[PDB]
């Protein structure tokens, strides 16, 4: 069971990298959305 | 004629002081400032717009 727990720790490391990948995906999505909104707002302010 | 108000009189030295004092308002500084402002506004506009 300790060896199985070590395999579970490896799977948990894979879960942590999956959590990292989902966090990177959400971070990139929020970052692109905010940067696009900010660029549009800055362009609108510059046009005004 | 009638009321003694002549249409015009010869210039006097006291009148000459006011004639010398009278001048057109000078706008050369204002025109230079307006030209500088419009030129700098054009320069700012050149890179202001998003590419």
UniProtKB/Swiss-Prot annotation, chain A:
Cysteine disulfide links: none
Organism domain of life: Eukaryota
Complex and partners: Component of the Smc5-Smc6 complex which consists of KRE29, MMS21, NSE1, NSE3, NSE4, NSE5, SMC5 and SMC6.
UniProt organism field: Saccharomyces cerevisiae (strain ATCC 204508 / S288c) (Baker's yeast)
Gene name of the encoded protein: SMC5
Protein name as it appears in the record: Structural maintenance of chromosomes protein 5
Sequence similarity: Belongs to the SMC family. SMC5 subfamily.
Localization annotation: Nucleus; Chromosome
Domain notes: The flexible hinge domain, which separates the large intramolecular coiled coil regions, allows the heterotypic interaction with the corresponding domain of smc6, forming a V-shaped heterodimer.
Processing after translation: Sumoylated by MMS21.
Additional comment: Present with 892 molecules/cell in log phase SD medium.
Swiss-Prot record, chain B:
Location(s), subcellular: Nucleus; Cytoplasm
Family: Belongs to the NSE2 family.
Other information: Present with 2800 molecules/cell in log phase SD medium.
Its job: Acts as an E3 ligase mediating SUMO/Smt3 attachment to SMC5 and YKU70. Acts in a DNA repair pathway for removal of UV-induced DNA damage that is distinct from classical nucleotide excision repair and in repair of ionizing radiation damage. Functions in homologous recombination repair of DNA double strand breaks and in recovery of stalled replication forks.
Subunit structure of this chain's protein: Component of the Smc5-Smc6 complex which consists of KRE29, NSE1, NSE2/MMS21, NSE3, NSE4, NSE5, SMC5 and SMC6.
Protein name (Swiss-Prot/TrEMBL): E3 SUMO-protein ligase MMS21
Lineage, top ranks: Eukaryota, Fungi, Dikarya, Ascomycota, Saccharomycotina
Full-protein interval shown: 4 to 54 of 267
């Amino acid at each position: 069971h300790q060896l199985n727990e070590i395999r579970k720790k490896y799977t948990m490391r894979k879960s942590t990298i999956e959590t990292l990948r989902e966090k990177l995906d959400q971070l990139k999505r929020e970052a692109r959305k905010d940067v696009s909104q900010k660029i549009k707002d800055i362009d609108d302010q510059i046009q005004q | 004629n009638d009321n003694p108000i002549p249409k015009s009189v010869p210039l006097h030295p006291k009148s000459g002081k006011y004639f010398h004092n009278l001048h057109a308002r000078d706008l050369s500084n204002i025109y230079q400032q307006c030209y500088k402002q419009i030129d700098e506004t054009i320069n700012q506009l050149v890179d202001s717009t998003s590419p």
